[PDB]
Design a protein around this ligand. Sequence first.
Ligand SMILES: *[C@@H]1O[C@H](CO)[C@@H](O)[C@H](O)[C@H]1NC(C)=O
Ligand SMILES: *[C@@H]1O[C@H](CO)[C@@H](O)[C@H](O)[C@H]1NC(C)=O
Ligand SMILES: *[C@@H]1O[C@H](CO)[C@@H](O)[C@H](O)[C@H]1NC(C)=O
Lengths: 495, 495, 495
Amino acid sequence: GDRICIGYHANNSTTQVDTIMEKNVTVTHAQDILEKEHNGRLCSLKGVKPLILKNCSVAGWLLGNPMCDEFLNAPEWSYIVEKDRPSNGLCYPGTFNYYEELKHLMSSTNQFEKIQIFPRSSWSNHDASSGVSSACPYNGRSSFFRNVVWLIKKNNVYRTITRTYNNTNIEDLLIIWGIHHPNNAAEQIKLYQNPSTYVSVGTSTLNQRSIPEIATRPKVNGLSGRMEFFWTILRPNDSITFESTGNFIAPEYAYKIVKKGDSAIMKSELSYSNCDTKCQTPVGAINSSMPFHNVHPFAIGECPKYVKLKKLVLATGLRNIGAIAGFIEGGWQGMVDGWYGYHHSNEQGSGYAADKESTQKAVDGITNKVNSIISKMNSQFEAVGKEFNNLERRIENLNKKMEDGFIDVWTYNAELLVLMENERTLDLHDSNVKNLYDKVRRQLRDNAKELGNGCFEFYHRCDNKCMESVRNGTYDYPQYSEESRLKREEIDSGL
Amino acid sequence: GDRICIGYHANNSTTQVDTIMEKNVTVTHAQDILEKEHNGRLCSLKGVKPLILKNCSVAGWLLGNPMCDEFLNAPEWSYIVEKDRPSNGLCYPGTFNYYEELKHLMSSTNQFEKIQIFPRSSWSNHDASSGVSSACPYNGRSSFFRNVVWLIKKNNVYRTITRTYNNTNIEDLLIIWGIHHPNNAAEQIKLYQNPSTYVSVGTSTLNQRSIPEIATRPKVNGLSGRMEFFWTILRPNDSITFESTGNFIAPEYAYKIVKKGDSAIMKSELSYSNCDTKCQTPVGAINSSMPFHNVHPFAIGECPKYVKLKKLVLATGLRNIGAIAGFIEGGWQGMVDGWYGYHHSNEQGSGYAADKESTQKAVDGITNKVNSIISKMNSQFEAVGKEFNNLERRIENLNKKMEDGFIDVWTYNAELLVLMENERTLDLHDSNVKNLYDKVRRQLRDNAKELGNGCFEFYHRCDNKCMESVRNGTYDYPQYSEESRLKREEIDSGL
Amino acid sequence: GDRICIGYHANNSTTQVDTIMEKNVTVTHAQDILEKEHNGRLCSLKGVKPLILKNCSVAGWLLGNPMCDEFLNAPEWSYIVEKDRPSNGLCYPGTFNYYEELKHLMSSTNQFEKIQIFPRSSWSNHDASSGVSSACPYNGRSSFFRNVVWLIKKNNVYRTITRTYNNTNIEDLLIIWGIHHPNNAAEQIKLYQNPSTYVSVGTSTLNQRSIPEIATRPKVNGLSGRMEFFWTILRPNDSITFESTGNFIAPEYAYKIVKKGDSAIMKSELSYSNCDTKCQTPVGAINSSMPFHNVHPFAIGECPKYVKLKKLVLATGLRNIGAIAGFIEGGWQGMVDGWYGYHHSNEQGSGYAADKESTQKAVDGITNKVNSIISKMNSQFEAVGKEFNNLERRIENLNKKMEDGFIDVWTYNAELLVLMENERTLDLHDSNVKNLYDKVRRQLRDNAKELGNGCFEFYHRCDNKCMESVRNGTYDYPQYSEESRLKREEIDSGL
Ligand SMILES: *[C@@H]1O[C@H](CO)[C@@H](O)[C@H](O)[C@H]1NC(C)=O
Ligand SMILES: *[C@@H]1O[C@H](CO)[C@@H](O)[C@H](O)[C@H]1NC(C)=O
Ligand SMILES: *[C@@H]1O[C@H](CO)[C@@H](O)[C@H](O)[C@H]1NC(C)=O
């Protein structure tokens, strides 16, 4: 009898972690940091709803394709949702110049207010009602974009248009207009009389003379003609003047840019639900509590950092071991209120007290090290949506290689940090356990025999209140020295 | 007499590794992971040959510059090889719009099939044979691009061309055409009669009216005129219509895009050899076995990861030490079948048995850690060729800074990983050796005296079959205890 | 009496470092590596002065806006300084095509030489003196750009200009010209007679016919007309020919590109001082001695690496502890000439000698590890200035995300390296101190009793010259063995 052992926690845990050195290492306590689920729904972002475009493209929305919903309420939005291949775009076919740049403006815009700048009924000298088409059906009747006017010769005459608008608002105006490219020389005269026309636009920054480019083209949405749209931002206190002799697709409504901020165009097929989120991906929203996730790289909102991993587990406690007779052989299920501690084995005692002078000192630096790991990726790369046209494949690939490149870099960093500090965490517990034993051996010097399994046997009587002499860094050699003095030479001369 | 020692491997090795802390550290076993050689040849990639362009540029190939080889076999290719400054390009001088975007399409294309869409002899109303030039010699005779037709007025008349082609194939078609920019007003009439002309092209996506831009220009390849080429991809089931009144350089042959995939345009001066490779760089092919290389950043194929380093050596075993009398003084050349082990020194024995309970346990986690290091760069950045024109210097520099930037990042990572796990590898062996000694000291407790050099001397007789009691974690103190009991007090009372 | 202790340095230091595990760790010796100050001045770079543009933009400089200084001395420069919103640019309003590409050329250019190519007085057939404007005041009198000529009809006639210049210099020429866009059809005739005009330019690489685009525009700097400028680089031995029938803004002076190299356009509001620097940022110059800084990301010159951190401190020495009686309890202020060492306590002695066999061996690998850390970021990312126009927002954001992305990556690396090697540095000292004790215990074996506080008490007389037996790895057990032999059994039988 008369012993004492140094030992460590063990429990029912089957959590597993990895290191540089080993895989699947069972530990007492561990912390998952990777989010892997989403809810498959499309939600408001912290109370603010997305602008859902349904089957419409940004072009169809902005020009007012009759199949598309106008937003009369002038709502603000958190993000914009556009399907992958929207069916309602330029119902009258053609091109929309610097479309992808316009879409990129929307990513920093959170609210429009449509304002009328040239009322449809202010074109005295021209036909403002015949410009409609079977390609733009509203309720099965031929119609046209709601926000631009297809002006047409009146009484076989098309008087020169010169018309100006002064931006007397505080806000930038987004202004859109267009030009008609007819099918042949006869069509041009039929519509606009004058055989050779132009559309001239002028601001303090933009000077442009546009000219109708006639070609023989195959039918799109039934039509061989085309229309080409343009856009500009008219700054506060600047003015814009249009002059045309024909083919002018004139603006009616402009868009006051009333709120700039963090926004996005998300490409998703989902539809909106009664749902709110902190973090939205194109395939569903995420419970943003953990610091990493692998759901989708184009997450927006207050999001965890995206990494290309199947798992990310930080070790926090000891390995999980029976585990009998001191630390050399494993950990104690019997120890409950601590990670490292002791075992009494007394004339009075049984054992299993915990040393929380070093248990708390370890729970201190572990939970401090954990938060440090997470916050070290506070500035981790976050991907940003952009689109490119079919003649911008190089910069599109540049952009892909950059974003994938940063995701790979940070994936690597996140993994390496976890593996490396995991090895350091497990190694710390080892050194803490080995430190505990040494604290005791440096106290009980001669008065006890090292048993080689993690326990000491006393060459003297100790009793319970000396069993905290040893725990409290207080045991004094002298006051038990003379008793030990004698009993060990009794061993040296016993049987 | 009566001893036993704890010791470690040593051998003839002069392999050297580095750590954060020290350079040039001699070790027992080490693993080079950096490829530094190439074969200076240009090879097929895994059985598939490159498309070698010789002295021709992609433009010269595609338009059929008479000096360039057509590939009648419609071969597939693994990569394309273009010299740095090819001598055969636009033999008739001019410009090729969105050339760099076209070249970027080739990087995802692996096979063309040339098809005739407008046969050269189908231009009834025009001269399809006089459009040839001293600038385009075929066998010293004046000639012209093989795949486009320089249509010319017939009988002093040039009737309006309107001509259509429907893509009734499964595959995308690459279609090229052009327009002639004459030298002066008289030249225009001499060639095309009609003083004011255009070239109009129309598909469902492309609308274009082109106009001849006359200027007085210095001679290139002898000529002051210029020709400007265009290209489009005509989707399956779409049609393309051309209309011109003059200056039309019409297409004859289009290119069926029959195989898309991983390809590249490599800028190299080398010529092809009977040679196959897994990994090709512009200065030679590489033996893709090691995980890193430093030959060239624009390697393609199944390649090691490129890093800007002169060396990369992983330590696998112990440092390399004579080295006498236990681990405190160095390693044993005498130990051969293990990294750590013992030395007998018995009434019967000599020594040098190896502890492979911990040798194999170390060879386990070292070879497992090695593979983990390599696979951690599986997603390392790989550079991708692209070209830019002289008005795209900003995005060209963006692209350079990005690729060099990622190469630097991964160079850093690769080096830091090797140095850091090298320090961890050497430190592991130390702790393994120190662990071995402790296993023995915790067994032989009182029965032996620690000699302070890594060896124990027995206070009792052991014999050979107890010398595996100690090796096998099986030695029991008690069955030799009473013999030791007596002999140590004989030391305490000897001479 | 009769003792000896193993101990470590301690001193007056209050330097603090951090690790992964702990913050604010007081150490004996530490090395700041982060530069955080600048001098708020704009300096020459290593003897070479910046080209200070004052209130002028690159356009105003190059065209010779009468408000801008010409640099008649043809100076070379280290960088160019442009204010954020320069007030003197196109005094006659309009556009400058591929302006941002031109600015990017300046970033690789270090010296121009202005040369006259078409002398202002060589335009016999035209009015070379009436083209001046109230928008371009020189000394309150109407004037015009100094380097281009606004040619005007002479005697109500404007004869066709055809004019050529051959670049017979070694150097590339930067050549600028322009075209006038009038306000209305009457203005065109008033100025250039001929109602329909063009400006044609031709080199071996550039073919261009420019056409005047009339529009009704609001007044900028008082004027509603606009002028559009163009530029090209004319290679040595190439020639450029201009032809116009009106609206030609002709070149007078071209710029010989005489020195290429490392340069930059810095956006700064500062003005130049009698000051020289190695490293210049837009808000001030930096004392480039330390390896990192956080002053500004757009630093140029021979600069430390920019990181987004408030502090970066490498630990070099031990933690800073009174600290009595051996290493178990803290470090010795009393030890002065070393980091680790001993304490005598002799019949003759007091103590405090330093073990510089391991002190120098640690100062060796610490100062070697430090330099290794710095040089590992030799290839760290460095940001590069570029500008983008209002239709290049996507590539501008691409460029921002790339540069911020690399700065974040390297910020992370720098921090992680310091924290991790800091933990390794502190841990090294611990292991060095623990190694010292063990060197002594493996010598003095039986002859001394381990006191458990870091000190040994001798069972024999040692004297001073044996106190270096112990320090010099030379103490021999035998020559004191028989004396110890007896005195310990006197303890075993004392009182
Ligand atoms: C979009 O079009 C689909 C056809 O695929 C139609 O069934 C559906 O009603 C439309 N969705 C919305 C949200 O309007
Ligand atoms: C390319 O041109 C060179 C002239 O530098 C000529 O000698 C050689 O035959 C050509 N090479 C090939 C592969 O046709
Ligand atoms: C620039 O213009 C300012 C007006 O803000 C004027 O006061 C100053 O003299 C000018 N600075 C220089 C360096 O010419």
